[PDB]
């Protein structure tokens, strides 16, 4: 049913018709209008200053493999939903960081 | 009929007549030429409202100052990527080595190129026109005419 | 907007603009092109690639390690069981989906 509902075109004219026949609420109107400002304000909490973080995060470094950091980040992000249970079957090595290439030229 | 549309167009007409008195000259006895879109192509560089316009300037300085803080880091990023993927530091610069444009150079030649002044002027024109269209659709029906009156380039 | 505090905070500090623009999209930024995307069209898990690019920027000097710590220590957003399964590889980070998709879904 979700797929069939996603079969709809969602065109500018269709969106205008939907907004006309089914008007948004005032709060929804305001959030759609100021999504950009809200998104920037949301980022302001991470791209402004070093926040006080839990201490076990000091184990993660720039040298840690991206897969380990992805595991930790997904475990911490969905912590309210999953209550510490792990997420499996998702992570795949990054192509550039996985390979340690070497180009052989002549006598090399 | 269409009283508001005629009000706005008559306002634009009287302003055009006031700024350029020679526009009243009929029978094409004036030296002013009225050109439809396809015939204004070799003049688009001349329509520049550099003065009485500050938003494109602030945009350019902001973009320059933001780019200047990451150019050397991005060069190091691509250097490390090449060093990991080949073991040599000239993976990306082999064909060109000439001049290797960094992000700072890219910003400088995007903003200092030709058509840069034209693209800032027309970005301002489009921004103002869209603001006026939004105001008209809402129903303000006041101050719906914008005059920049820049020297050598009058735009309404 | 009546309040311009956010726009002034971003305008008066270009370092914030640079940090946001270099941050990968999956982590809440606007950098939708990954370093691995230069070579591979098929990316697999995009969060691992985003973390790798964050590491590259941190070690070069574009970003800072405290940005990574802030992202790791970020307070979980407003996610449900439907959001973890509708689009995997995604984090419980608010405002990750644009208002364009919201308008399409509303229509």
Curated annotation (Swiss-Prot), chain A:
This protein's superkingdom? Answer: Viruses
Q: Which residues form a coiled coil?
A: none
Protein name (record): RNA-directed RNA polymerase L
Task: Give the record's family classification.
Answer: Belongs to the paramyxovirus L protein family.
Subcellular compartments: Virion
Q: How does it associate, per the subunit comment? A: Interacts with the P protein; this interaction forms the polymerase complex. Interacts with host RUVBL1 and RUVBL2 (R2TP complex); this interaction regulates the viral transcription.
Function, as annotated, reads: RNA-directed RNA polymerase that catalyzes the transcription of viral mRNAs, their capping and polyadenylation. The template is composed of the viral RNA tightly encapsidated by the nucleoprotein (N). The viral polymerase binds to the genomic RNA at the 3' leader promoter, and transcribes subsequently all viral mRNAs with a decreasing efficiency. The first gene is the most transcribed, and the last the least transcribed. The viral phosphoprotein acts as a processivity factor. Capping is concomitant with initiation of mRNA transcription.
From Swiss-Prot, chain B:
Compartments, record wording: Virion
The superkingdom of the source organism is: Viruses
Q: Which residues form a coiled coil?
A: none
Q: What does this protein do?
A: RNA-directed RNA polymerase that catalyzes the transcription of viral mRNAs, their capping and polyadenylation. The template is composed of the viral RNA tightly encapsidated by the nucleoprotein (N). The viral polymerase binds to the genomic RNA at the 3' leader promoter, and transcribes subsequently all viral mRNAs with a decreasing efficiency. The first gene is the most transcribed, and the last the least transcribed. The viral phosphoprotein acts as a processivity factor. Capping is concomitant with initiation of mRNA transcription.
Per UniProt, subunit arrangement is:
Interacts with the P protein; this interaction forms the polymerase complex. Interacts with host RUVBL1 and RUVBL2 (R2TP complex); this interaction regulates the viral transcription.
Q: Which family does it belong to?
A: Belongs to the paramyxovirus L protein family.
Tell me the protein's name. RNA-directed RNA polymerase L
């Amino acid at each position: 049913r979700k797929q069939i509902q996603g079969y709809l075109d969602s065109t500018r004219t269709i969106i205008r018709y939907s907004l006309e026949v089914r008007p948004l609420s005032a709060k929804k109107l305001n959030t759609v209008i100021e999504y950009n400002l809200l998104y920037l304000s949301y980022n302001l909490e991470i791209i402004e200053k070093p926040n006080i973080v839990q201490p076990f995060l000091n184990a993660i470094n720039v040298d840690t493999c991206s897969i380990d950091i992805a595991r930790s980040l997904r475990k911490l992000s969905w912590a309210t939903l999953l209550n510490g249970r792990p997420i499996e079957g998702l992570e795949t090595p990054d192509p550039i960081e996985l390979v340690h290439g070497c180009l052989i030229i002549g006598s090399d | 009929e269409e009283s508001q549309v005629h009000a706005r167009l008559k306002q634009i007409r009287v302003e055009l007549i006031a700024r350029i008195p020679s526009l009243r000259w009929t029978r094409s006895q004036r030296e002013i030429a009225i050109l439809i879109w396809p015939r204004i192509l070799p003049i688009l560089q001349a329509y520049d409202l550099r003065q009485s316009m500050q938003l494109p300037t602030v945009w350019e300085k902001l973009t320059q100052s933001t780019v200047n803080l990451i150019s050397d880091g991005l060069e190091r990023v691509v250097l490390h990527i090449s060093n990991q993927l080949t073991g040599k530091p000239n993976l990306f610069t082999r064909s060109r080595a000439y001049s290797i444009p960094s992000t700072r150079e890219l910003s400088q030649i995007w903003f200092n190129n030709e058509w840069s002044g034209s693209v800032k002027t027309w970005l301002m024109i489009k921004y103002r026109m869209r603001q006026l269209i939004t105001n008209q659709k809402t129903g303000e029906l006041t101050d719906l005419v914008t005059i920049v009156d820049t020297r050598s380039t009058l735009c309404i | 907007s009546l309040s311009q505090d956010i726009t002034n905070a971003y305008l008066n500090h270009p370092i914030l603009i640079s940090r946001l623009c270099l941050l990968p999209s999956q982590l809440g930024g606007l950098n939708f092109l990954s370093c691995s995307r230069l070579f591979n069209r098929n990316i697999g898990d995009p969060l691992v690639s985003a973390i790798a690019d964050v590491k590259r920027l941190i070690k070069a000097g574009c970003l800072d390690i405290w940005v990574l710590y802030n992202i790791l220590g970020r307070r979980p957003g407003k996610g449900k069981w439907s959001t973890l399964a509708a689009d995997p590889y995604t984090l419980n980070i608010d405002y990750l989906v644009p208002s364009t998709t919201f308008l399409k879904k509303h229509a």
